[PDB]
Amino acid sequence: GRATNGQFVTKTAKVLRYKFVRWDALLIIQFIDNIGVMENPTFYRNKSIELRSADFLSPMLNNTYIVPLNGGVRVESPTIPVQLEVILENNSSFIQVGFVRLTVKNGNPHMIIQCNPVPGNIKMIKIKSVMLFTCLIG
Amino acid sequence: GRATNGQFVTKTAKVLRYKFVRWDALLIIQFIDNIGVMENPTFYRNKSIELRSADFLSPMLNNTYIVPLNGGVRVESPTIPVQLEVILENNSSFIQVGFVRLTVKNGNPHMIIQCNPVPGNIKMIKIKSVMLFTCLIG
Amino acid sequence: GRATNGQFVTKTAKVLRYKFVRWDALLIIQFIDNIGVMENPTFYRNKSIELRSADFLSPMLNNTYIVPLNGGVRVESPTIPVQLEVILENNSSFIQVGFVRLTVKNGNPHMIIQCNPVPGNIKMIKIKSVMLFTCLIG
Ligand SMILES: CC(=O)N[C@H]1[C@H]([C@H](O)[C@H](O)CO)O[C@@](O)(C(=O)O)C[C@@H]1O
Numbered sequence A, B, C: 001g002r003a004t005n006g007q008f009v010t011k012t013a014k015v016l017r018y019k020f021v022r023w024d025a026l027l028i029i030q031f032i033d034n035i036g037v038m039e040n041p042t043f044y045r046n047k048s049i050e051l052r053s054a055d056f057l058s059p060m061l062n063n064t065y066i067v068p069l070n071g072g073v074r075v076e077s078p079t080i081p082v083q084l085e086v087i088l089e090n091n092s093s094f095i096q097v098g099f100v101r102l103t104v105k106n107g108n109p110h111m112i113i114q115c116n117p118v119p120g121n122i123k124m125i126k127i128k129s130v131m132l133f134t135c136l137i138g
């Protein structure tokens, strides 16, 4: 069909907006807050989905950051790689290939974000990529 | 339609299970053995598809590991990046961004896994990502 | 439906061929010039989509290479990661995980290619991955 709007909301009430398409056993879902743009004819700007410490579960093990969500859809997605920028508490930052999934636990959707080791605690993760998940239902 | 079960089998008789959907010129296929889970409310476990030396062709050139398969479907897929853990014979291991495709040769499906150089011979590759391929047929 | 042929053309008249499928709000598009092959039973060859300096806009900021295109389709795609080889003017080269999108500016399609810093100016970028974009329209 045509693309339907939706959103998830984080623990700190951040709204993550998306559009989706739901066919037979298929759900395709794109996050739409950070679609990058050419702002003039020579410059491309990435936009970030910004996720702070307070959006993650504690304790964090093995560079796995879990973002409990409310609302939206309940899918076991595949893993997608993304561009991350991981900001440490001392404001240093590392660009990384991150790996993201949507999973369901206790009937709730969670975003799983895995990245590499950093020399410090993380203040914030920015997803700089446009994320789209193709998912199989049932 | 609804999602149909299938599998490939490796040279050592490892079974790689998947579900798929086949529409007009479109085949979407997800490997389902290693769907990660939140096992309690704070911990996410990745699962691995584990591929050993004996599942690969010899000789291996340019960090390209070829896994001949039997059964399943015959597709020329796009390339997907994945999380790999590459275990060396001396049990050291390296986490890498791997790149995976399905290709067909002599009427047989093969999984192509490319990764980075490692200081040793590889005993095992673990794919820690949930893999889904969207493929164009004909 | 069945897969339709198309192409984009670069500033230097390089033709980038693709096949696509356009359903309701959905456009799936695969670039087809560099489908890798097993050429004998033990060897896999990657093929490259080769993009030179003259195919990019100037000035280049933040390791973002913008390839203005003509013809083809007009989509705001998600970001896909790919295998790049980035060739410097002194012929040294770096293998990287690149991130690619299609975007539209002034009614024209552009391919956005982002990679990592390199110690020199880039002569050429080779995309060694088979690229397929799943896109949401409207
Ligand atoms: C990836 C996956 O399978 N997730 C499932 C989890 C885990 O399987 C449990 O940890 C097993 O106890 O179980 C559910 O019943 C749940 O609690 O919501 C459904 C959910 O989809």
Ligand SMILES: CC(=O)N[C@H]1[C@H]([C@H](O)[C@H](O)CO)O[C@@](O)(C(=O)O)C[C@@H]1O
Binding pocket: B076, B103, B104, B105, B106, B107, B108, C035, C036, C037, C038, C039, C040
């Ligand atoms: C990616 C690709 O094109 N693979 C094709 C190969 C190679 O083209 C051959 O190496 C050309 O001789 O050829 C086939 O006939 C084959 O042997 O099964 C079909 C297969 O899909």
Ligand SMILES: CC(=O)N[C@H]1[C@H]([C@H](O)[C@H](O)CO)O[C@@](O)(C(=O)O)C[C@@H]1O
Binding pocket: A035, A036, A037, A038, A039, A040, C076, C103, C104, C105, C106, C107, C108
């Ligand atoms: C990602 C995105 O939104 N791109 C859009 C751009 C930018 O929004 C402009 O920079 C805003 O002025 O605007 C268009 O009208 C354009 O010039 O073709 C449509 C295009 O799809």
